[PDB]
């Protein structure tokens, strides 16, 4: 798939707002993902034990990882499709070390879209959401193709 420049602009305009508070968006997203699909929490051996949203909100570690995650995702979006290099190390660790099924990447894509919609309704109308969705489908498709070359296709 190929996004047009206008779609990338809609994606990088709402991402510039996310970058005004990387840690808070990172937290929101991971929590939304763990509340919505609790099974994904089990993948994190470092967070697994957290029992409530209040415990999640108070975890410094979780908030630090959320920054790591968004930083990595942001560097991929700013490439505007030319992300081959960035994707390599990410696909290798999630497919071989962490073992993250494609289905989970769909779950966190849904969490990202929920959170932008709640925080940024004025910059995340229907067209901007269809473009973000197009950009995350691209990402998932390329990661899935790499998973396959690596021997996991999960």
Q: Which of 25, 32, 83, 94 binds ligand HEM (CB under 6 A)?
A: 94
- Give me the helices (H) in 37-153, please: 53-58, 60-77, 84-92, 102-119, 126-150
Burial 66-101 (b: 16+ CB within 10 A, else e): beebbeebeebbeebeebeebbeebbeebbeeeebb
Smallest distance from ligand HEM to CB 116, Å: 13
| Separation between Cα atoms, residue 77 and residue 29, nearest integer Å | 17
Q: Which of 3, 22, 67, 69 binds ligand HEM (CB under 6 A)?
A: 69
65 is in an annotated binding site: yes
98 is in an annotated binding site: no
Smallest distance from ligand HEM to CB 135, Å: 11
Q: Which residue has the tokens 């081959």?
A: 84
**Interface segment toward ligand HEM; rule CB under 6 A; list 9-17, 37-45, 80-88, 121-129:** 37-45
| Separation between Cα atoms, residue 137 and residue 123, nearest integer Å | 20
Give the binding-site size for ligand HEM (rule: CB under 6 A).
17
* Site membership for ligand HEM, residue 32 (CB under 6 A): no
Annotated binding residues for O2: 65
**Contact positions vs ligand HEM (CB under 6 A):** 40, 43-44, 46, 65, 68-69, 72-73, 90, 93-94, 98, 100, 104-105, 108
């Amino acid at each position: 798939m190929v996004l047009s420049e206008g779609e990338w602009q809609l994606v990088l305009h709402v991402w510039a707002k996310v970058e005004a508070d990387v840690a808070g968006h990172g937290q929101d997203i991971l929590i939304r993902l763990f509340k919505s699909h609790p099974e994904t929490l089990e993948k994190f051996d470092r967070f697994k034990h957290l029992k409530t949203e209040a415990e999640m909100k108070a975890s410094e570690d979780l908030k630090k990882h959320g920054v790591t995650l968004l930083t990595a995702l942001g560097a991929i979006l700013k490439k505007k499709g030319h992300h081959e290099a960035e994707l390599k190390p990410l696909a290798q660790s999630h497919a071989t070390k962490h073992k993250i099924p494609i289905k989970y990447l769909e779950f966190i894509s849904e969490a990202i879209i929920h959170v932008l919609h709640s925080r940024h309704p004025g910059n995340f109308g229907a067209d901007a959401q269809g473009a973000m969705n197009k950009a995350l489908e691209l990402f998932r498709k390329d990661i899935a193709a790499k998973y396959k070359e690596l021997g996991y296709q999960g």
